[PDB]
């Protein structure tokens, strides 16, 4: 019986816009879309 999976901590800016200030700025125009993803990944780690 499996008990847990590998815990992941993907990051919005580093994954999407690697060290690009303009790209990060245009990501900020998307609102808090990805803070949800960070919170959900923290959650999945916590449940593991």
């Amino acid at each position: 019986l499996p008990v847990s999976m590998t815990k992941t901590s993907v990051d919005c800016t580093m994954y999407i816009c690697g060290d690009s200030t303009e790209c990060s700025n245009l990501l900020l125009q998307y609102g808090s879309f990805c803070t949800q993803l960070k919170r959900a990944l923290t959650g999945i780690a916590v449940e593991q």
Binding site: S9, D11, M14, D19
Partner: protein
């Protein structure tokens, strides 16, 4: 005409340990998945974002 690799800068994560601010104000910091002999020289170079 030689071969050179390419590596991540230092990509990692920062987690902050703290008791309730109603209890104290001291903090201790984490640096996720990075040998921090590398950040110890990094703070000396002040290259830490």
């Amino acid at each position: 005409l030689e071969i050179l690799d390419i590596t991540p800068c230092s990509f990692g994560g920062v987690s902050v340990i703290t008791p309730g601010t109603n209890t104290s104000n001291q903090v201790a910091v984490l640096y996720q998945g990075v040998n921090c002999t590398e950040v110890s020289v990094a703070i000396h170079a002040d290259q830490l974002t």
